[PDB]
Amino acid sequence: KATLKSLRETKANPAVSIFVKTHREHPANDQDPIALKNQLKIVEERLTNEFDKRTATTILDKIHAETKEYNHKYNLDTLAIFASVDDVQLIRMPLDTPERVVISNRFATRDLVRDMASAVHYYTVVLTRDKARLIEAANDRVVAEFDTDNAKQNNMEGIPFPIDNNGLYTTGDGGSDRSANNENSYLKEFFNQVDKSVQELWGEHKMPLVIVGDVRNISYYKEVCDRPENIIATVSNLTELEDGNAQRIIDGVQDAVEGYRTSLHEAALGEIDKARGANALSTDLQDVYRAAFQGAGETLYVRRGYIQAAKVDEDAQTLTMAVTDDAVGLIIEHVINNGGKAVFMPQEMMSADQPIALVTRY
Amino acid sequence: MIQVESMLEVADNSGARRVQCIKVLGGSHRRYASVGDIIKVTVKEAIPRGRVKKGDVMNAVVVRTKKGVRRPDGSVLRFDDNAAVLLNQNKAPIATRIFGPVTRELRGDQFMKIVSLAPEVL
Amino acid sequence: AFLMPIEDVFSISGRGTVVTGRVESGIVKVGDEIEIVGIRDTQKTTCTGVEMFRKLLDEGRAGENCGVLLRGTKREDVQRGQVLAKPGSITPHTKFDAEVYVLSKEEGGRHTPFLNGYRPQFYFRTTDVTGAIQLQDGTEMVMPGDNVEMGVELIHPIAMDKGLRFAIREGGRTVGAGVVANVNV
RNA sequence: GUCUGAGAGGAUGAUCAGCCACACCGGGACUGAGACACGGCCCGGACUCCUACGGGAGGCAGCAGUGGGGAAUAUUGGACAAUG
RNA sequence: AAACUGAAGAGUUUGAUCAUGGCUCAGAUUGAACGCU
RNA sequence: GGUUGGCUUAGAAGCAGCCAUCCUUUAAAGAAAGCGUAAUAGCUCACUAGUCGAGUCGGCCUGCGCGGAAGAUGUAACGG
């Protein structure tokens, strides 16, 4: 059970979630073993205090049987351990979380939820005066390259990718002269055909696209695009457009992808304001928890690191200030479980005085 | 009569010494700025460790011109230099001292601060 | 007595720390012994002048927007929210009983009712402060439009006494009004 | 002279006493036995303030004291009774 | 009569040793600051 | 009226969707043809009775018409 679709459904007791700040490079990862030891120390002490020593010992030996072969030279940003009385699942995440221990019925999966909510799937259109390429990219990896062996190009009414610019002027025949200065018009029409192929492929999937290429090529394409509202980013400082591989292109578009995610988080503020005006936004922790538990909330807006402990009972729907170690984690779990959405807004865009908001369904 | 690419002295202590007009504001094809008219400037010469630095693009108001300003009786009033006072984003003065005289065309609401801080007003 | 909510805190070299506001009661004069009661512990000072528009004033009385110098006190030991009271006139409190009237949807307010454990913002004179509402024993809900006597626990002390009105917001949207009926300890 | 050192040396030049230099910055002098004058003058300058916008004023490195800087250094006291 | 009175070493390189040699410490002092009192 | 049909779903109450279309007071009333609600609520409809009083309703085919119908020197797409 290494996935979010299994952690939320393994409802053990006690369910122990341990988070360790790890490092990818040396000697920063030199203190990763010590951090792991300290987190397991507090885990053992709390488990003995809250439960029996036998159930602390079985859990800790199970964690140790899996962490004894851990290589700390291959650590990502966070090491998450999900331990039970019977199973232990440890996963490495490129997300940064604050080191903590959560002992509850369910596994603390708000970091997995945030990582999945930050997911961006997009197209990369790589332009050149000589060719066009199309890549499908998920977050920071290439999904596919759109070459000859693909299903999405089987039944195509346009030129399939990779598209060569075999214009009559490029080969030197066809009925045109260089003294006519038609080259810009030729580039515009070639990019128009490229956009035709892009739209044909996009109609079956409908994801935002990033335009990569020279500034002039991007210009011509933007003026020629049939659906220019779906364009979310343009990068003109990416190198080796014709020979570099898809992973290299996706590596080079990551700054623009992050800027796009930031723009989405900025846009979320307007919807929060609309809910506040319509009287459908709850910002108190008690009200937010009650609405989330009774399934009244459609969107949650957390401040990306707003952990809070409280006394929560699901009988009178009360939340008194400190117990549950992550009351915000419980709110996120209820919102997700009742078919809602969770948005983890950045700190510089959501105030620390009001770090949680809930757009309710009524 | 100040147009784009004309240089101006700075009649204030914002830190700038010379500014260059890069836009006469207030109209599609507007040609000249006289005294009291708002211009976009680039700072070409700034005092070390001042508030503005060389290359800032900001607002200024023309305060004196070599071409001169006309008066209702038909008199003209000419200065030996073209000078400007730097403004903030809301077109409000950013200085606390004014150098040299100004004219009464700055009288009003926004540039009353320049008028009150000027050594002499004509 | 004399009371002035502190609005702005700045300083003049040679003269000292000037705390401008609006005098709501009494008068202030050069030599008056005063106290700063509010967010932090009470600090006892003396008045060394009153001015307005960079001009010395004869005396500042209730109604005008006068500013006042404080003797010795520095400009990080006073902040917007405390009040310059006359010694012993008022006391800094964090627990009280109110006559809170919850706004209804028609006037703004909310659809949801106030419930015990709710921590809205409390606007006393010229300062907001988080405070937990504790409904009087025998009640777990307060519908909008009603008006009941609850007990408020502020996070940090606010100078107040029985009679002071205040507003309860939840984001800049007013969700209730109230008047302190009794201060506790 | 002070600290250190057995000494020779080394480090240092608060408080007390002698000498020198300076008095917001640059410059000039007047009066006088004595000054190029800390709480005098003239000119210029920066800064601060008053103005009726024409013009004016000012200098705590005196003693208290303020703001500021700082790790950090005090009273907005009394008397000329004593020595000057 | 007197002003003529004053001088300590230790630890640490080596398997051990002697030497060399740096580092460190025990003293005195202050217009001292900070912490506890 | 059983009844918020069962399921599903945060909620699914005639009216998101999936599976039946049953019964009762009936002159008649769909486990509902629409609007509406987060869901209920609410407004209609189908249907029935009453009023009035004579023809009326909806498909099919066929002829001729209408819209769909924006361009560059000047009407300028009957030669007038």
Coordinates of N, CA and C in Angstrom, one line a residue, chain A residues 6 10 61 125 180 188 194 196 198 203 211 237 241 244-245 262 273 275 286 303 313 347:
Chain A
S6 N -4.8 3.7 -1.3 CA -4.7 2.6 -0.3 C -4.5 3.1 1.1
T10 N -6.8 2.0 4.3 CA -6.3 1.2 5.4 C -6.6 1.9 6.7
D61 N 9.4 -2.5 16.0 CA 10.2 -3.6 15.3 C 9.8 -3.7 13.8
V125 N 4.2 22.0 -27.1 CA 4.3 22.2 -28.6 C 5.7 22.8 -28.8
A180 N 10.4 37.7 -53.4 CA 9.1 38.1 -53.1 C 8.9 38.3 -51.6
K188 N 4.0 31.5 -41.1 CA 2.7 31.6 -40.5 C 1.8 30.5 -41.0
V194 N 0.5 23.3 -38.1 CA 0.9 22.8 -36.9 C -0.2 22.9 -35.8
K196 N -3.3 23.1 -36.5 CA -4.4 22.2 -36.9 C -4.1 20.8 -36.3
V198 N -2.3 20.2 -33.7 CA -2.4 20.3 -32.2 C -3.9 20.3 -31.8
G203 N -8.5 17.8 -29.1 CA -9.9 17.6 -29.0 C -10.2 16.3 -28.3
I211 N 3.8 26.5 -25.2 CA 4.5 26.7 -26.5 C 5.9 27.0 -26.2
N237 N 13.5 30.3 -24.0 CA 14.9 30.1 -23.6 C 15.3 28.7 -23.5
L241 N 15.8 22.5 -29.4 CA 14.5 22.2 -29.7 C 14.3 21.1 -30.7
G244 N 17.2 17.7 -28.8 CA 17.0 17.4 -27.4 C 15.8 16.5 -27.2
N245 N 15.8 15.7 -26.2 CA 14.8 14.7 -25.9 C 13.6 15.3 -25.1
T262 N 1.1 28.8 -9.7 CA 1.0 30.1 -8.9 C -0.1 30.9 -9.4
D273 N -13.4 35.1 -2.5 CA -14.1 36.3 -2.3 C -15.5 36.2 -2.8
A275 N -17.4 33.5 -2.7 CA -18.1 32.8 -1.7 C -18.3 33.7 -0.5
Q286 N -14.1 25.5 14.0 CA -15.3 24.8 14.4 C -16.3 24.6 13.3
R303 N -3.7 26.8 4.2 CA -2.5 27.6 4.0 C -1.2 26.9 3.9
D313 N -14.9 15.6 18.6 CA -15.8 14.4 18.8 C -16.9 14.5 17.8
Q347 N 1.7 30.5 1.2 CA 1.7 31.3 2.4 C 1.6 32.8 2.0

